[model samples]
Target: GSHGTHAPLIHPLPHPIDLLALQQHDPARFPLLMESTASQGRWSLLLVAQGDGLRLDADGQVRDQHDLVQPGTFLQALDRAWQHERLSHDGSHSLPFRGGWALMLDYEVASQIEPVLPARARGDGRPTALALRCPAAVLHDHHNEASFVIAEAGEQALLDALVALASAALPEAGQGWQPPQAVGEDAPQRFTDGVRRVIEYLRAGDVFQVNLSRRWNAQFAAPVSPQALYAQLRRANPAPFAGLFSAHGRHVVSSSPERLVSVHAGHAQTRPIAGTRPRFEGDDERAEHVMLIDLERNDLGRICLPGTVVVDELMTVESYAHVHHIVSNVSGHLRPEVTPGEVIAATFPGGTITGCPKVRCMQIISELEQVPRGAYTGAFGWLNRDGDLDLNILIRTAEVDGHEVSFRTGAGIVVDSDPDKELDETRAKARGLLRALG
Candidate 1:
């Protein structure tokens, strides 16, 4: 128990290990890689787990079958799963450590349960989620030391494997991924035109801010290693929410900096990163950075208890590898009856990514974006059985379907926004992945 609450057992690692190599050690059995930097804290965790687990799709499919969790009832189904006794021995645990689920819900999946918008955006051509049984062997990396925890179902073979893998050193770096010739969804002119349309909408009071994205893709003759790509991307753009995982014949790699929401101990938290600029300082950049802090505080209020939601931090400048962003933290206590699915449903696509007045901005986004936002603007992460979750905005992510690699980048189009500047910003954001693939 943790401070009077029942928690998972924590064990220290015998030796240090490279989480990236350990995750790639076995792609098939260990398909999920969840890494978080403790949101700028000193410690980080790298979880490698198997895929023999449950899944719920956007269109009512579970696992590989077309079993609907019921079109409008998927969220409730997830809640039931969290409370389902069949999945574990008890529901008294307060975290998703030993028997938690690793989930990936696409942008389109939001429409399955919530009727606020249609699932109009094109997805990255992957299912909504594949919830796997928690693997016993997890590596926890601290600043100077590392530890391994066989939380539950600690198979002897797995422990032995971990012992062997942890004591050894990672191999010398080989050649990195070659950047392929990429095609864009819209060129500069077209993207600028789209931005102009969004500005016009803002002028007409259609929406305050609409996030616009430029999608890019390339066809390769061979399958790409997501593990390798993610490693390069992380080094190039070390973010707070970088992750890598393989599922549904595709590899999902991300180097995202935004934190959507993290709920724990009845407290709900959402960090919306709205403003973007390159690594420089200016008055205009300063003004744009703080524009969306209010929007996020309001978004959190939807599910937060009355008078509990507040902006703990406002428009703080956070720097990543390639660019600088204006980030803010909004948190609150979840109302008495709010469930994990309910909290997620309320905060769906995140305010900063969609814009203020979320549903309408999503409509504008659907109207303007050529490819569906898919997992790019959506969120992905692990939701533990303890009703705790940590999800990241799926920006700076590549959805690799074998030889096909798809990625997206975008900027917020507010009133008085320069279409040309917005266009350039997308390019600025693409530097990390482009550099990684080279």
Candidate 2:
């Protein structure tokens, strides 16, 4: 059992299959659908992001809930999904071929989801970015991976629009932390031990890297705001690193990022990332990259053709606000016999988080880590009307579990790993966030 943990908590809304009935009856909520799912061999879980549902006023604060959709609903769905124990026995990102399952999605197809602009921004004196999100049917059609092929239209074409926006990303102004001459006091003993224990678990065959993380909070007079703290943290520690998920934005913004599964109809795709590094000057980066690539390819091979797995970008250097990362992208087509759910069951908990020899590493992590990684290191995202999905690795995140808010942050540690340096980096990453309350 995980340290300091009690019995597994059971969720209330246990039977979501009943909710499926509502999906067909009301039909209005699926209006701007992006994906849909049905439990194949195991259960199929869906998570969707409905932008119109969020309305924020000036100064980037949520003023009210505009649409009927409630943010809590999906989170509750995830908690329930996990309780179902349909996770791959391997603890992979995808659902297992038997027993239970889950499918999550978060969107970067944002331009399609972006709100209509005020005319003034349009120079037309109307809210411009005013693009109506495709209704459930449009998004549902994109689910063609399972049934009919999704046609390019309305919301689905939104995919093409993003490709156009893709270019060399603009340079971001930011900085990463520099450890102190000694950096002793800054690196708390328990914190480092916590990280060490998790790593020890990995080494001991407890679990794979459970994405152990933490939160930093500091006091300030009146000058600090949560937004500023977030922005500065991003600047301080830029890309190929963790994400800045603005609970304020309900958004997951990350650099050196990882992609979860994106599915259509019964077909699906997964990108397994397995690697790590400091901001610079280390072999750990390349070593981890190669290890993860091999692991990922093998993962994909499990659900598809032996050679279907291919690396699109390998050891590509991507620099961000605070960090530099050697990243790679792997792609695979589902086997003629495999269902989308089966594909996920094969390749989860991206290799980067775990050490090479994934299966063994996960066992080590479980034995060493201090707690069960309920959501961290697990995929977090939206499941939609059509069968489409986009889930994040959920690396950098905070948990607001009723007043006791906690989070996790750590760099992957390999055999050549420096325990002290890794500890320092964890504090460096938390520096900005710690000052938020001030």
Candidate 3:
């Protein structure tokens, strides 16, 4: 039997929010919605499944059948699944995702790939890694304005179900949805102190730079739907890599703009988003952005063929709702034998989120932040069975665990970083997420 299949079934490209409404009442479906609200993005995908496909605990233990089994590492488990499925991509299909693994990895998962120190343990019980073995999906081609129900070849029934669901009537927007109230947050003074600490570390020669963050915890006046909150976020701040993942009573809503890494036709690429205006180009911001470009180029070089790695886009200014970002693109031809898992393992937590000297910066982050970041600075996206991969940095992202919703925002700290200005930058980065709550 073939591992997977794709077929086209016609349906209107319903607003991703409205489409989300259809599944608001169904948690068992384990829905994952990846949306591209910006013109530069070309596709939106919705993947659903009836069972918990793959989940790994902090120790990288997977629940196989009825018992827990050690998978060595999260990436190892993912690689096993990919190889077992044996889905091959011939590059004949127009769709980017043709049913593979839709994954959500926690920031702490970086420790599994690198020798980074761990932060204080989290009591929330969130999985370190969650991946769904998606066999079918509703693909929305934003540029072409076409929608299709793509499923495995023999699963005609699954295809019909998806088509019907996609064609369902749009639901009316809900009323009386209240914005969450701030329950707890890192004091501005404390965040500034953290910046000062990083600066001291830089001066002491402990590290060149470190990305530090502060947390915000908010509560809804009443329980609110994650889908609705995502809708509000989409409207308030449209981004190229926004997504929502809901399963087992936990939800992650992200309005991220940075691509962690992507692989297509054996060409690997990563877009590192560094300094924000204070850009278009400031001396400080330009320096920060260039440092990250070098870091990312080196990261890709680990798994990519030597002499093939290069910085494709030196630096470009990208504007979002609140600020302008200095972004750069780096790419290389992947060595043919490198697996999808190796591609991600080589670049788990992006350098832009952690600072220069990836391992040391991560250690600094762990020491200063104190608490585990969970999903805040992690990566989320899909790994197609065909070996193509795409993931985004979890920047303006929120984690909704039951009734409590929490998020964190941060700025990169250099030796000369202004403590006050860095504090302000964290706020500027969180504007859209805070607005979404309201």
Pick by lDDT: 2 or 3, better one: 3
Q: Which pairs clash (backbone N, Cα, C closer than 3 Å) in model 3? A: none
> Residue 142 CA error for candidate 3 (Å)?
4.7
Ranking by TM-score: 3, 1, 2
Native RMSD of candidate 2 (Å)? 18.4
TM-score of each: 0.79, 0.43, 0.84
Q: Write the per-residue lDDT of candidate 2 for residues 192-224, one digit (tens) a residue.
A: 675666556544743323333334323232222
lDDT tens digits, residue span 1-438, model 1: 634333355556667666666666656555566665542343444554544455654344554234434333446666776676223224353233554666666776666645665555234435665655554546555555666755444355665665666657766332356666654445677688888898788779656566788887766656766776777777787665567766666577877756777776567777554333222211123333333334443355777778887654322222222122333336788876667678777677776677655677777776777555667866766666556667776777888776677888888776667777778888888775676676
Best TM-score among the predictions, by candidate number:
3
Better of 2 and 3 by TM-score: 3
Task: Tell me how far the alpha carbon of residue 393 in candidate 2 is from the true structure, in angstroms, after superposition.
Answer: 1.1
> What Cα-based lDDT does every candidate model obtain?
0.62, 0.35, 0.69
Indicate the worst ten consecutive residues by lDDT in candidate 1: 315-324
Segments of candidate 2 deviating more than 4 angstroms: 1-257, 264-298, 311-329, 384-386, 435-438
Q: Which candidate should be chosen as best, given lDDT against the real structure?
A: 3
